[PDB]
Amino acid sequence: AFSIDDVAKQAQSLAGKGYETPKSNLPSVFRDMKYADYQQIQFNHDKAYWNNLKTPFKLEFYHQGMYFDTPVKINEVTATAVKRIKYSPDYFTFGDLGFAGFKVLYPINSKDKNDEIVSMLGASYFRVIGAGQVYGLSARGLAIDTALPSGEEFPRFKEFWIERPKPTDKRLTIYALLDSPRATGAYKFVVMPGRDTVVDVQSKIYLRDKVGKLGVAPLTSMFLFGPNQPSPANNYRPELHDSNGLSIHAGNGEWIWRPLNNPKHLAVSSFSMENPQGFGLLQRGRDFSRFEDLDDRYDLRPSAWVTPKGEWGKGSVELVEIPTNDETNNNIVAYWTPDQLPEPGKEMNFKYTITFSRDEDKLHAPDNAWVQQTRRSTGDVKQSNLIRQPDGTIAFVVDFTGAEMKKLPEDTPVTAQTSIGDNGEIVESTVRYNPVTKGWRLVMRVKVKDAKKTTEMRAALVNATLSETWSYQLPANE
Amino acid sequence: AFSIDDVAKQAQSLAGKGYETPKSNLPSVFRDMKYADYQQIQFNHDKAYWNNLKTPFKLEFYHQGMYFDTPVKINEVTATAVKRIKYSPDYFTFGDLGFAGFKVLYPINSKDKNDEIVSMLGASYFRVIGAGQVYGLSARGLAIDTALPSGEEFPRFKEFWIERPKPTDKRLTIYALLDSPRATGAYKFVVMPGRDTVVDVQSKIYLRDKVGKLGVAPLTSMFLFGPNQPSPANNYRPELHDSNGLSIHAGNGEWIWRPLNNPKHLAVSSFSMENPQGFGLLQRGRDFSRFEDLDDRYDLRPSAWVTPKGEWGKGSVELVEIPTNDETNNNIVAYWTPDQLPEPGKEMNFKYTITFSRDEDKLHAPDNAWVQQTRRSTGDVKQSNLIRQPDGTIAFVVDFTGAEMKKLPEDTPVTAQTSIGDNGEIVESTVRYNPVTKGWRLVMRVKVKDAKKTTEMRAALVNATLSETWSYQLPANE
Ligand SMILES: OC[C@H]1O[C@@H](O[C@H]2[C@H](O[C@H]3[C@H](O[C@H]4[C@H](O[C@H]5[C@H](O[C@H]6[C@H](O[C@H]7[C@H](O[C@H]8[C@H](O[C@H]9[C@H](O[C@H]%10[C@H](O[C@H]%11[C@H](O[C@H]%12[C@H](O[C@H]%13[C@H](O[C@H]%14[C@H](O[C@H]%15[C@H](O[C@@H]%16[C@@H](O)[C@H](O)[C@@H](CO)O[C@H]%16O)O[C@H](CO)[C@@H](O)[C@@H]%15O)O[C@H](CO)[C@@H](O)[C@@H]%14O)O[C@H](CO)[C@@H](O)[C@@H]%13O)O[C@H](CO)[C@@H](O)[C@@H]%12O)O[C@H](CO)[C@@H](O)[C@@H]%11O)O[C@H](CO)[C@@H](O)[C@@H]%10O)O[C@H](CO)[C@@H](O)[C@@H]9O)O[C@H](CO)[C@@H](O)[C@@H]8O)O[C@H](CO)[C@@H](O)[C@@H]7O)O[C@H](CO)[C@@H](O)[C@@H]6O)O[C@H](CO)[C@@H](O)[C@@H]5O)O[C@H](CO)[C@@H](O)[C@@H]4O)O[C@H](CO)[C@@H](O)[C@@H]3O)O[C@H](CO)[C@@H](O)[C@@H]2O)[C@H](O)[C@@H](O)[C@@H]1O
Ligand SMILES: OC[C@H]1O[C@@H](O[C@H]2[C@H](O[C@H]3[C@H](O[C@H]4[C@H](O[C@H]5[C@H](O[C@H]6[C@H](O[C@H]7[C@H](O[C@H]8[C@H](O[C@H]9[C@H](O[C@H]%10[C@H](O[C@H]%11[C@H](O[C@H]%12[C@H](O[C@H]%13[C@H](O[C@H]%14[C@H](O[C@H]%15[C@H](O[C@@H]%16[C@@H](O)[C@H](O)[C@@H](CO)O[C@H]%16O)O[C@H](CO)[C@@H](O)[C@@H]%15O)O[C@H](CO)[C@@H](O)[C@@H]%14O)O[C@H](CO)[C@@H](O)[C@@H]%13O)O[C@H](CO)[C@@H](O)[C@@H]%12O)O[C@H](CO)[C@@H](O)[C@@H]%11O)O[C@H](CO)[C@@H](O)[C@@H]%10O)O[C@H](CO)[C@@H](O)[C@@H]9O)O[C@H](CO)[C@@H](O)[C@@H]8O)O[C@H](CO)[C@@H](O)[C@@H]7O)O[C@H](CO)[C@@H](O)[C@@H]6O)O[C@H](CO)[C@@H](O)[C@@H]5O)O[C@H](CO)[C@@H](O)[C@@H]4O)O[C@H](CO)[C@@H](O)[C@@H]3O)O[C@H](CO)[C@@H](O)[C@@H]2O)[C@H](O)[C@@H](O)[C@@H]1O
């Protein structure tokens, strides 16, 4: 009955007309709120949608506040009707504005507890979690001109339709209409809560005008510090980040792992390929000892893996790393950016799944080893007297692990194929067996010729390829 | 037949005569050796003592080299004889000097592998390990004038007698004669290899002249950096130390835990008491993730716990912390120093056990919680906008755990009784439940008034005492 086509015709139609700028009529008392103040507004769980039905799903809504200062329209779809969900203040306690966004609840952790699984709130952003997870990185519907000096353009999901589920349904269907100065689109999301929460996405996109850069299936995260770039000041937390790497499964079948930085200057990195097999911002390594944060539980925050359905043609998986002095800034972005876009008006179809998981092993081929961690260190040489003498190099300790690598005999003759750009020199490239992890450790020591330039390096473990490619960048002014 | 009395009469007799300075006739080629060079000398395992007997014990010997440049005499005791073990170069390959010291082998880890359990080498030092352990901290027979500006005096074990074991014996008996400018002594060690290796010690000590300070049952270790005092430079190792705290079981029954520092200036700390119940340099926290060192395995290095037999009267358990830029210096010392020593010639009896273990829980009363770790951090206040704003305080995150604490209901109302010296002010003293550890976490934030003075603080968890006392010192110029 109702389908993506219904929403695509609105999108098609919006693309053919001048963009209408949303206008805020939000009172100052709400717009001026900071996060802590925004908490004063809570939803009345007695008024949650589907409270009268035998579904484990429920729908709750956000009030406008902070920079969430334009309304979105929300519709329920039934077998027989599309019904606007009417706004009311009586959905909230505060101790015709319109909803800011919505969330979905489901007993994903405990049978008699309705826990959040999806949050759609801000622009075209959503956050998703599976069982035992805590909200971390975000996804968007679309990105336009991300990292361009001209200024990024942020689409919004301005309207939603949410199908009322049947009592036995284990998935939830959501449609969204996207509008942005130079683009519109129609989105069908099928959400499947589980150990992982999986989101099936179909999109239909239309430019209203030409753009510098489109970013398809965007992910947005945060990296403040980690063992590859330790906290400049003492912190009880060894690490702080919603993600620690970009994993790519290339067109050509190579696995690439780019550990994240919090750089001094904006860094955009393009992995140019044809027909990407997948990409994800991953949180690899979940021992609580790596984080020690009892409030935000970064150890419990998901990885997100994007899997295209079909051939996305020629473009790049692009990473954006933004300087931040704190964790409140989303300083990591990843997307697919097509090399060539169509003329305005012409429809682009993108189909993909997003998997939100804490099983990074499952987000990787079992016959291909992967980097558990990248530890930076002062490069040294142990003297005859056992004193470790610094020699001016930087050292990277890169531990590989894997479902198949953890199985290999200790005596397996593993070596490293490495490379470095011109601003750097590899002094040492050693591989040894790690009997604690059943994996293999690479130690790479490098001299930087000019600290004021970027240095890029690559490494993989081979017998005679066993591992993904560690693709590391050492930011200028590090 | 043979007993400690045999050795005590030699000791008694040496104390009544002028001290004879040992003389080195070691060739330059050996004295000039650094550790790596000293390795060139290996013992011929075919010539190990007791190779002709049905004992799991074996005895091997060290060649002189480095600063091990005076001989020690070694004797075997049998039922019928004391026999000098004759020196020979044919005990070694090099690819009448006399032995430098000896080691004991035993199948403590694997049934057909003779692994080291005891090393007696250098002055009056020995190192001991149980099953699955790697050599770490040391013990001595005695310490004299440790940390005194006049200069420490180092006794040596100049002669040893080692009882030949019966085939079924699970212990080994060793006697040693101690000589030092101003003191002599006789030592019986009974070594019991196990999961822990336990050393039963009887000593008889005689001063040849008055001394500034005697140190009974000394332990010697090393602390380079840890989470309470993180590596000033990037290191892949989160921590590096053979020990991370002094545990005291006081005369009065209090448990005290003093986390170690690598200070900028010599720090001596005295815990004055009567009838100490025990003390030990402990390595608390053995996840490999804390160390990451595959060469030296600090995670596998023992704790040593000293248990007096009898009442040692009035004195102090004393800790000495020495500045070091590297791990090769033994910059941690602990001992019992009597308040009052007898006149020279008069015999002092000290009986005690040393337990070398990796079960720190077993080195502590089950009804008393203990500090798993002390993490230093920049003190901050989270703002309304979730940004953590530094306020100029230093924060200590102190996690408690325990066989009984891990059992307590989460809702148990645990609070902290704390205190600080005059150079400091406690701004925050918070206790929360740690659901990952089943323990409780203390966060203490303090302002230092003068960074150029030492600051001391104490804290314990109480219901209405649950924990040992965390006795922390913040070194001047930290
Ligand atoms: O019944 C029974 C019982 O119960 C109980 O209880 C219980 C429970 O239960 C319950 C349940 O619960 C649940 C839970 O809950 C919880 C909660 O939760 C929640 C959550 O919260 C959280 C939070 O979150 C938050 C967030 O955060 C985040 C973030 O991120 C984010 C973001 O934000 C941001 C932003 O963004 C934006 C964007 O941006 C972009 C950009 O752009 C920009 C630009 O930029 C540029 C640059 O520039 C720069 C700037 O910016 C700056 O400013 C400067 C200065 O500095 O700098 C510079 O540089 O530049 C560059 C170069 O040049 C460029 O390129 C760029 O562009 O800028 C501009 C300016 O100029 C601007 O404007 C713009 O914007 O860009 C970039 C690039 O591209 C990118 O990347 C970015 O992105 O933008 C856009 C457009 O516009 C927008 O839209 C956005 O917004 O930004 C800012 C700045 O800008 C910042 O600030 C921020 O931050 O956002 C987004 C969107 O929205 C998102 O997505 C994201 O996420 O951050 C971080 C990262 O970084 C992360 O990490 C975080 O997380 O945030 C937001 C806002 O604010 C909010 O909204 C939220 O909220 O978080 C925290 C922390 O972490 C945590 O803690 C929390 O938690 O949330 C959610 C939502 O999301 C909700 O839903 C939830 O609810 O919480 C609470 C506390 O509070 C608690 O309490 C609770 O619990 O949960 C769980 C899970 O987890 C579950 O499971 C559960 O279930 O619930 C239910 C329902 O309700 C009920 O029923 C129940 O009850 O449970 C539990 C468990 O189990 C238990 O325990 C309990 O017990 C009770 O009590 C009783 O009674 C009962 O009985
Ligand atoms: O058969 C089958 C198969 O097998 C195979 O193989 C296998 C195997 O098997 C086998 C077995 O094996 C085994 C193993 O083995 C191994 C080995 O092992 C070994 C070991 O080694 C190790 C090492 O060790 C070493 C050591 O080290 C250590 C150290 O410590 C020590 C010490 O040292 C030090 C010194 O000390 C001294 C003292 O000092 C004191 C002081 O005083 C001083 C003064 O001071 C002052 C100050 O001042 C300062 C100065 O000093 C400076 O200089 C400056 C400048 O800077 O500064 C300043 O400041 O001041 C202050 C304030 O003012 C004051 O207070 C002070 O006083 O000064 C002066 C000057 O002026 C001076 O003079 C003086 O001295 O004081 C303080 C205070 O009180 C104190 O504390 C201190 O103490 O002093 C004294 C008197 O004089 C002396 O005596 C001493 O010496 O010092 C120096 C400086 O001074 C330094 O440098 C040094 O370092 O020492 C002591 C004594 O001796 C001891 O006790 C200790 O320990 O260090 C650290 C700490 O720190 C530690 O940690 C370490 O450890 O060292 C030594 C010397 O050098 C040597 O001797 C040794 O050796 O270590 C390393 C590292 O860690 C390691 O790595 C190694 O390992 O050793 C042992 C012995 O001990 C032996 O025995 C053994 O053997 O190793 C190798 C490698 O190499 C390997 O390879 C092997 O493996 O083991 C295990 C266990 O672990 C076992 O289990 C096993 O069994 O064996 C058998 C038999 O042989 C056979 O049979 C078999 O075969 O097994 C394995 C496992 O299972 C496997 O894997 C394999 O495979 C094969 O191959 C095949 O073929 C076959 O088939």
Longest dimension (CA), chain A: 83
Judge: B397–A238 Cβ closer than 8 Å, yes or no: no
Q: Which CATH architecture has domain B4-363?
A: Distorted Sandwich (2.70)
Residue with tokens 């520092």: B261
* Gaps in chain B after residue (C–N beyond 2.5 Å): 95, 464
Are the beta carbons of B293 and B237 closer than 8 angstroms? yes
Please give the residue of chain A at the shortest CA–CA distance from B288. A436
By Cβ distance, the residue of B294, B377, B432 closest to A235 is: B377
Backbone angles phi, psi at A46, to 5 degrees: -65, -25
DSSP string, A24-60: ----HHHHT--HHHHTT-EE-GGG-BTTTSS-S-EEE
Annotation: CATH topology of A370-474: Immunoglobulin-like (2.60.40)
Rounded to whole angstroms, the Cα distance separating B372 from B364 reads: 12
Longest dimension (CA), chain B: 83
Judge: B236–A230 Cβ closer than 8 Å, yes or no: no
Rounded to whole angstroms, the Cα distance separating B435 from A294 reads: 8
Are the beta carbons of B418 and B429 closer than 8 angstroms? yes
Backbone angles phi, psi at B248, to 5 degrees: -120, 130
Are the beta carbons of A137 and A204 closer than 8 angstroms? no
Name which residue sits closest to atom 133 of ligand 1, judged by CA.
A119
- By DSSP bridging, strand B73-77 and strand B156-163 are parallel
Query: Closest Cα to residue B405, out of B365, B444, B369?
Result: B369
- Tell me which of B66, B236, B298 to substitute to probe the interface with A (most A C-beta atoms closer than 10 Å): B236
Are the beta carbons of A281 and A139 closer than 8 angstroms? no
Q: Which amino acid is at B160?
A: F
Please give the residue of chain B at the shortest CA–CA distance from A290. B289
Rounded to whole angstroms, the Cα distance separating B11 from B157 reads: 11
What spacing in Å lies between the alpha carbon of B119 and ligand 2's midpoint?
A: 10
| Nearest bound ligand to the CA of residue A265 | 1
Query: From which experimental method does this structure derive?
Result: X-ray
Chain A residues whose CB is inside 8 A of the B294 CB are 432, 434-436, 441
- Tell me which of A293, A294, A393, A444 to substitute to probe the interface with B (most B C-beta atoms closer than 10 Å): A294
CB pairs under 8 A between A and B: 87
For residue A283, CA distances in Å to A199, A360, A474, B291, B343 come to 18, 8, 20, 22, 67
- By DSSP bridging, strand B255-259 and strand B469-474 are parallel
Residue with tokens 């329920």: A76
Residue with tokens 């919603």: A242
- By DSSP bridging, strand A156-163 and strand A73-77 are parallel
Q: Which amino acid is at A259?
A: P
Rounded to whole angstroms, the Cα distance separating B64 from B29 reads: 11
Q: Is A288 helix (H, G, I), strand (E, B) or coil?
A: helix
Rounded to whole angstroms, the Cα distance separating B257 from B252 reads: 15
Q: Which amino acid is at B441?
A: R
Q: Is A97 helix (H, G, I), strand (E, B) or coil?
A: coil
Token pair of B122 as six digits: 């250098």
Chain B residues whose CB is inside 8 A of the A376 CB are 234, 236
CB atoms within 10 A of CB B404: 12
Rounded to whole angstroms, the Cα distance separating A162 from A318 reads: 32
Who contacts B67 (Cβ-Cβ below 8 Å, separation ≥6)?
B31, B122
Q: Which amino acid is at A189?
A: F
DSSP state of A478: -
Token pair of A197 as six digits: 């929460």
- By DSSP bridging, strand A303-308 and strand A278-282 are antiparallel
Ranges of CATH 2.60.40.10 domains, chain A: 370-474
Query: Closest Cα to residue A287, out of A437, A431, A131, A129?
Result: A437
In angstroms, what separates the C-alpha of B197 from chain A's closest C-alpha?
A: 24
| Three-class HEC string of chain B | CCCHHHHHHHHHHHHCCCCCCCCCCCCHHHHCCCHHHHCCCEECHHHCECCCCCCCCEEEEECCECCECCCCEEEEECCCCEEECCCCHHHEECCCCCCCEEEEEECCCCCCCCEEEEEEECCCEEEECCCCCCCCCEEECEEECCCCCCCCECCEEEEEEEECCCCCCCCEEEEEEEEECCEEEEEEEEEECCCCEEEEEEEEEEECCCCCCEEEEEEEECEEEECCECCCCCCCCCCEECCCEEEEECCCCCEEEEECCCCCCCEEEEEEEECCCEEEEECCCCCHHHCCCCCCCHHHCCEEEEEECCCCCEEEEEEEECCCCCCCCCCEEEEEEECCCCCCCCEEEEEEEEEEECCHHHHCCCCCEEEEEEEEEEEEEECCCCCEEEEEEEEEEEEEECCCHHHCCCCCCCEEEEEECCCEEEEEEEEEEECCCCEEEEEEEEEECCCCCCEEEEEEEECCCCECEEEEEECCCC
Considering only CB atoms, which residues of chain A are within 8 Å of chain B? 34-37, 227, 230, 233-238, 287-290, 292, 294, 326-328, 375-378, 383-388, 390, 395, 397, 432, 434-436, 441
Token pair of B100 as six digits: 């430098």
DSSP state of A8: H
Ranges of CATH 2.70.98.10 domains, chain B: 4-363
Are the beta carbons of B366 and B339 closer than 8 angstroms? no
Q: Is A418 helix (H, G, I), strand (E, B) or coil?
A: strand
